[PDB]
Amino acid sequence: HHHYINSMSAPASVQRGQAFTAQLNSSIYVQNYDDFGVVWGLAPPNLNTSACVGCVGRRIGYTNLFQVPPSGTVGVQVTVPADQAPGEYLLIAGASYLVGASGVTGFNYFNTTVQVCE
Amino acid sequence: HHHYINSMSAPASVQRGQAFTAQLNSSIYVQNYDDFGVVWGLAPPNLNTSACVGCVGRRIGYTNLFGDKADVQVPPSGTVGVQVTVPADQAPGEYLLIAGASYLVGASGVTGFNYFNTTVQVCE
Ligand SMILES: *[C@@H]1O[C@H](CO)[C@@H](O)[C@H](O)[C@H]1NC(C)=O
Ligand SMILES: *[C@@H]1O[C@H](CO)[C@@H](O)[C@H](O)[C@H]1NC(C)=O
Ligand SMILES: *[C@@H]1O[C@H](CO)[C@@H](O)[C@H](O)[C@H]1NC(C)=O
Ligand SMILES: *[C@@H]1O[C@H](CO)[C@@H](O)[C@H](O)[C@H]1NC(C)=O
Predict the structure, then answer these.
(1) Cα(first)–Cα(last) distance of chain A, in Å?
(2) How many whole angstroms from A49 Cα to the centroid of ligand 2?
């Protein structure tokens, strides 16, 4: 229990209804750290997280994690629903976690721009 | 898809090293609502959450709630029991049992944690 997800990547373009792979990177940490899961969201590219605290957009997946390489890469399956309108979006990964002796829990967010094609 | 965990209960006393049954209630929700999982923590009885934002204390369990491989099936409205086990080395005494339920809600996809606590005595 001493590694955390530190970043997320994904293809620049995806086809709706067709699964693709998102990559999650991890690194070692001194404090105890638990990655519980990752919610996958598809958001408008203009999303304002200050006005919409915690927002990830439309939920398109959830990955339970609680396997994961402590200091490397893991691939995760993600699908944009077939009915999604084409265009530019933000793909948002919301990683739930616990850290430390006090058990601080929360979400870390990672995003990338993706083009959703028919 | 339209229900949410709104409360938690547990026994007044639990034996360390032994699993006990905690209860999670759920209610109907107007907007779309996902419960992803519940982290179970043992926190000092004096925990100030204003100073320790989002703290659950020592992690003693995690219940995955999403998908068909979910640990338990939450009824849209009602209660479900969850097996939670206090570590065998836990110091005896009074604690807060804290349940941290991760969620997503609404068309904007607001994600976060809801916290429910109850006082529990841990005995040898
Ligand atoms: C993830 O980590 C690997 C090295 O472990 C690196 O090659 C890759 O570029 C990283 N991706 C991101 C988005 O940081
Ligand atoms: C997307 O991530 C960047 C950092 O990688 C951050 O500055 C930006 O606020 C994020 N956007 C949203 C909508 O979360
Ligand atoms: C909801 O939980 C409370 C205790 O937290 C309990 O009194 C009640 O019976 C529960 N709901 C149902 C349907 O029993
Ligand atoms: C315990 O739950 C009550 C709700 O009845 C809440 O007011 C209180 O802040 C909780 N305690 C902590 C330490 O969060």
Answers:
(1) 41
(2) 8
Chain CA centroid to CA B98, Å: 6
**Residue B36 forms contact with A (CB below 8 Å):** yes
- The CATH number of A3-117 is which of 1.50.10.10, 3.30.830.10, 3.30.365.10, 2.60.40.1930? 2.60.40.1930
Please tell me the distance from the alpha carbon of residue A59 to that of residue A80, in angstroms, as a whole number: 9
Q: Token pair of A50, please?
A: 């200050």
Closest CA to ligand 1's atom 10: A25
Residue ranges of domains in chain A = 3-117
**Nearest CB to B109; choose among A37, A55, A105:** A55
- The binding-site residues of ligand 2, defined as CB within 6 angstroms of any ligand atom, are A 47, 49, 90, 109, 111
| B3-123, CATH topology level | Immunoglobulin-like (2.60.40)
Instruction: Give the Cβ contact number of residue A17 at 10 Å.
Output: 12
Non-local (6+) Cβ contacts of B48 within 8 A are: none
